[PDB]
């Protein structure tokens, strides 16, 4: 009893949870969480790197502003007053 296809997109993906065995979806969820953590860690690193770039030009004196736009969203808003 079935003439439906597989999945598309995830939907059916969760339907399989009924087949195979017990362990499955929870492990996948954990993997997804790990991926999210990697994504979050990357972003945190990127922000720190963005600071590393705005460093030097963190003292004072004209000089961007300037490259502060084009400028990874701060850069500016930052140059100003």
């Amino acid at each position: 009893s079935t003439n439906g296809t597989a999945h598309g997109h995830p939907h059916e993906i969760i339907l399989y949870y009924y087949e195979l065995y017990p362990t499955m979806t929870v492990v996948i969820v954990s993997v997804a969480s790990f991926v999210l953590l990697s994504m979050v860690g990357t972003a945190v690193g990127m922000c720190v790197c963005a600071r590393r770039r705005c460093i030097t030009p963190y003292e004072l004196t004209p000089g961007a502003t300037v490259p502060f736009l084009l400028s990874l969203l701060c850069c500016v808003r930052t140059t100003k007053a």
């Binding site: 195979l20 690193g45 790197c49």
Partner: protein, 46 residues
């Protein structure tokens, strides 16, 4: 069937998602390195 870790998923569709990933973590890693490189250029400039 035949192997272990429950294989499931999707040609096409499957490729759609796969193609995304490998793709943003590597990007931000490369960008990080490039930012370091530029920083060193500034350090050299001083």
């Amino acid at each position: 069937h035949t192997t272990l870790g429950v294989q499931d998923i999707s040609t096409t569709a499957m490729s759609w998602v796969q193609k995304i990933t490998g793709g943003v973590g590597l990007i931000v890693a490369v960008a990080a390195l490039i930012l370091i490189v530029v920083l060193c250029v500034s350090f050299s400039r001083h």
